[PDB]
Design a protein around this ligand. Structure first.
Ligand SMILES: Nc1ccn([C@H]2C[C@H](O)[C@@H](COP(=O)(O)OP(=O)(O)OP(=O)(O)O)O2)c(=O)n1
Ligand SMILES: Nc1ccn([C@H]2C[C@H](O)[C@@H](COP(=O)(O)OP(=O)(O)OP(=O)(O)O)O2)c(=O)n1
Ligand SMILES: [Mn+2]
Ligand SMILES: [Mn+2]
Ligand SMILES: [Mn+2]
Ligand SMILES: [Mn+2]
Lengths: 494, 494
DNA sequence: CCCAA
DNA sequence: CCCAA
């Protein structure tokens, strides 16, 4: 069944921010499997406990973008997420009209690993064929995106996009009103915005934006969208302006607006990908496959010169993930001679850009971690700069690399981790069990603060301490006991 | 008394978005005088009526910025604004700690016209002296502003900035909790964001940001702020980075974050103003005053060439209000020979940029508006462009110019105004009284929609129709009757 | 003096 | 094939 696949995707595969297909933003130690639909069905049925504050807060995660910009990802509290996932699954025969959208390329799908929503899984060549077919006969292309799409979704516009704005306002129950209420309860009983990273909020965004896709399709516009990004192919510049006007109208019906910084009109024929994609791919040492494994093992000079050229291209243009794409080009084709030099280049670059920190794990097996103690200082310096820059992706990834490889962590960097106080870093330190007393003092300060939302911001840490029998449940409800009794661990071992 | 000056400023001078000192965004026909303290004290006392929806919506206004970007200004519903203004004033001895801030340049003050808050009233030479004193001995400057400051203020952070975050969370009444509640009721019972344009929300932003200013001052940072823009002067680059880190920390305590697009570090000595300010002022025809009125009357060639050079500089740089500054340089020094040519240039430019539409009224008296009917087509074409571009400042300003000068308005652009459906343009058309039936159909559709927030979005139109005895009060409360009985007109004549 | 924020 | 969005 496909409805069951929705349930398993919502709980076990796309509860955490696992939407990136190439490499996960969150380290693989955190996971959402062994969170079975029966367990969420039990949590939703539970009525025990009482909360003074309406709604729930979410575990916060700050991931660096390509330009070192913070992006806010959220891990929803399992009570609110369990109710939301149950309500989404129980009415998928009313919701699955977002599956049959030809203008939304990123949408729920029945993937092999189990996830419904994977960002850029269709790859650039199937994208190339479609882009070539759409671009034919048109001499203008429009790139326009919503300004704050996930962060300013009006939750009360969830019923509207289901049944029309006017009919829903006149009717002021229906399933989409309850979906509105559950999406509000997921984030502090707040109508504006949705959490970023779970697939329930991406489902909500698909539901809202599918009405705009429908009323743009009915006017005969040939357009595609990737979440919030609309690309349009117009024979005339006038039809391009008319598309921008109609998109503004239909988004303003749902309290949404265009990002006019990124909204631009270009003259076809333009590049199908970005420019630096083609510049890196013509200069790539691995752009030709020789079908024998010895011939495509790159020497040290080729990888070093390609990485230097990629650094120059990223500095000169700065309009995309030049370094991410470049190191993902040449990291699997190395031989054992240049493994250490490339690892040193990656260490320097991953200090200078935290986004390149997850790549180290693919070369961390071949590099001898002990060596002359130098790599311990490498990882501790990276941890210190991750604490200062208040980034969560690189900091948690570096904790994962230090713990998984038995690399010691200094006390001063533990103290500035404490000062940073991001939830998943503290969950990793909790999993280390060395710093149990300092984690105990931190969660004790959270407890004596007496704020429900501050406990909800670290529910993952509190539940992980409960699962190893090191802390009582801060909540008076039985959701944590239901999760523990049925075997839910968000740091599972093999 | 200064408290009484606060109350008159809140109701009669800064209820509407009147913070711009050079020229108002809103046309002079809309005004907030004859809304005295006694009427607001009566409306706050009124308990009659019932509303199904908590909170109030606000009259929406979309003003184009220098780069044609829409900025959302809001006119708060007079019940919510009257309660909010009464609560702000009744505790000004607790609130006026924002007056004694030396880092907030734009703040409440006792001005001559009566407004508490005027943006850029100090002028650039008093700013020049202070900027020169601050910039001395420092070789780096930091420009960092909050990303969505007014739109993403958390209302529940209003108690925190009064009494500390931890003390307010432990206490979870105090006056700031009620100020929280009233600021929420001003905008749809929503904790996120404040309306833009009234001085109550600017007072709220001062209250929130003054704690950040205090904890930035205590570390010895020499910095200034203009609403949300922080400028800092550092002897070293590391002091600049440390200021950025501490500012990020103290804003993140209040769920606030920097705009890292506009956050940039420059090397002193940089210019006190922008670059194009200096290029326009060295090339200005009026940069020297000859103290006799005949000698500084500019000929046609000087003004035309200065405006063309300004158009070129605005096209080439595009980093500020080049055209706004340039036309405000040379518009008062014209003689009667070049008045019509400058009006034609302003008409073309004001069609191409709506922000230059308010200037036309200073040259609309000398030019014969009848002429050979051409100016009527000018204004109607500008109106159609304003309705296409969904801007409210230029559209309402052009309505003001057409109505005030007895200029006829075509029916097709009236229908396109109704299709746009901005509130203040419809208030002006209501004031014209020619289009009473179409306005009646529009507000009748709003009434049969049966939504409280859609009536609150056009409360000004509904009250203006109620004041001329052309429509009943949509609300069951007596606030409109209190305002009508005591003589409140938001379109008053002299 | 004449903008913006 | 190997990014982002
Ligand atoms: N790991 C994930 C999971 C989900 N999303 C979602 C949230 C974003 O809203 C959407 C794509 O939108 P943008 O990245 O363009 O971001 P915004 O719309 O929030 O802002 P802006 O237009 O200012 O960049 O993808 C994401 O970015 N990253
Ligand atoms: N006529 C008025 C009255 C008030 N404000 C307020 C609201 C704005 O939040 C604040 C200054 O902030 P910015 O103009 O820099 O705008 P934002 O902070 O909203 O956004 P961004 O940093 O993206 O420009 O001034 C304004 O801009 N214009
Ligand atoms: Mn966007
Ligand atoms: Mn996008
Ligand atoms: Mn800002
Ligand atoms: Mn600003």
């Amino acid at each position: 069944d496909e409805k069951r696949h929705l349930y398993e995707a919502l709980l076990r595969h796309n509860y955490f921010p696992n939407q990136k297909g190439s490499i996960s933003e969150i380290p693989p130690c955190f996971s959402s499997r062994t969170f079975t639909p029966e367990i969420a069905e039990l949590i939703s049925s539970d009525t025990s406990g009482r909360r003074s504050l309406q709604g729930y807060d979410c575990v916060e995660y700050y991931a660096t973008r390509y330009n070192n910009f913070p992006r806010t990802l959220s891990i929803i509290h399992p009570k609110a997420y369990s109710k939301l996932a149950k309500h989404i699954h129980d009415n998928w025969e009313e919701i699955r009209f977002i599956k049959e959208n030809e203008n939304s390329m990123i949408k729920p799908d029945m993937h092999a690993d189990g996830r419904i929503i994977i960002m850029n899984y269709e790859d650039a060549e199937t994208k190339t064929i479609r882009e070539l077919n759409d671009g034919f006969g048109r001499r203008f292309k429009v790139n326009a995106d919503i300004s704050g799409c996930f962060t300013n979704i009006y939750s009360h516009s969830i019923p509207w996009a289901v049944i029309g704005v006017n009919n829903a306002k006149i009717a002021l129950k229906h399933w989409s009103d309850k979906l509105d209420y559950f999406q509000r309860q997921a984030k502090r009983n707040e109508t504006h915005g949705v959490p970023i990273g779970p697939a329930t909020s991406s489902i909500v965004c698909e539901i809202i934006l599918s009405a705009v896709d429908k009323r743009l399709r009915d006017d005969g516009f040939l357009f595609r969208r990737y979440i919030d990004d609309y690309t349009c192919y117009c024979k005339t510049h006038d039809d391009a302006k008319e598309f921008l006007h109609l998109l503004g109208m239909e988004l303003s019906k749902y309290k949404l607006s265009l990002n006019l910084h990124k909204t631009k009109i270009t003259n076809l024929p333009g590049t199908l990908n970005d420019n630096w994609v083609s510049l890196l791919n013509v200069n790539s040492p691995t752009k030709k496959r020789f079908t024998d494994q010895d011939l495509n093992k790159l020497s040290s000079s080729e990888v070093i010169n390609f990485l230097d050229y990629a650094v120059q291209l990223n500095t000169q243009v700065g309009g995309g993930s030049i370094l991410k794409y470049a190191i993902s080009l040449v990291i699997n084709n190395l031989d054992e001679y240049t493994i250490t030099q490339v690892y040193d280049y990656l260490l320097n670059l991953s200090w200078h850009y935290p986004m390149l920190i997850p790549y180290l794990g693919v070369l961390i097996e071949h590099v001898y971690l002990d060596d002359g103690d130098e790599y311990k200082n490498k990882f501790n310096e990276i941890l210190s700069m991750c604490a200062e820059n208040k980034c969560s992706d690189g900091m948690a990834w570096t904790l994962y690399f230090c713990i998984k490889n038995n690399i010691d962590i200094d006390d001063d960097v533990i103290e500035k981790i404490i000062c940073f106080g991001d939830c998943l870093s503290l969950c990793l330190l909790d999993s280390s069990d060395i710093y149990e007393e300092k984690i105990n003092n931190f969660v004790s300060d959270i407890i004596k603060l007496d704020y429900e939302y501050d406990i909800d911001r670290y529910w993952l840490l509190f539940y992980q301490r409960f699962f190893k029998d090191k802390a009582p449940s801060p909540y008076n409800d039985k959701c944590f006991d239901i999760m523990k009794g049925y075997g839910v661990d968000f740091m599972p071992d093999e």
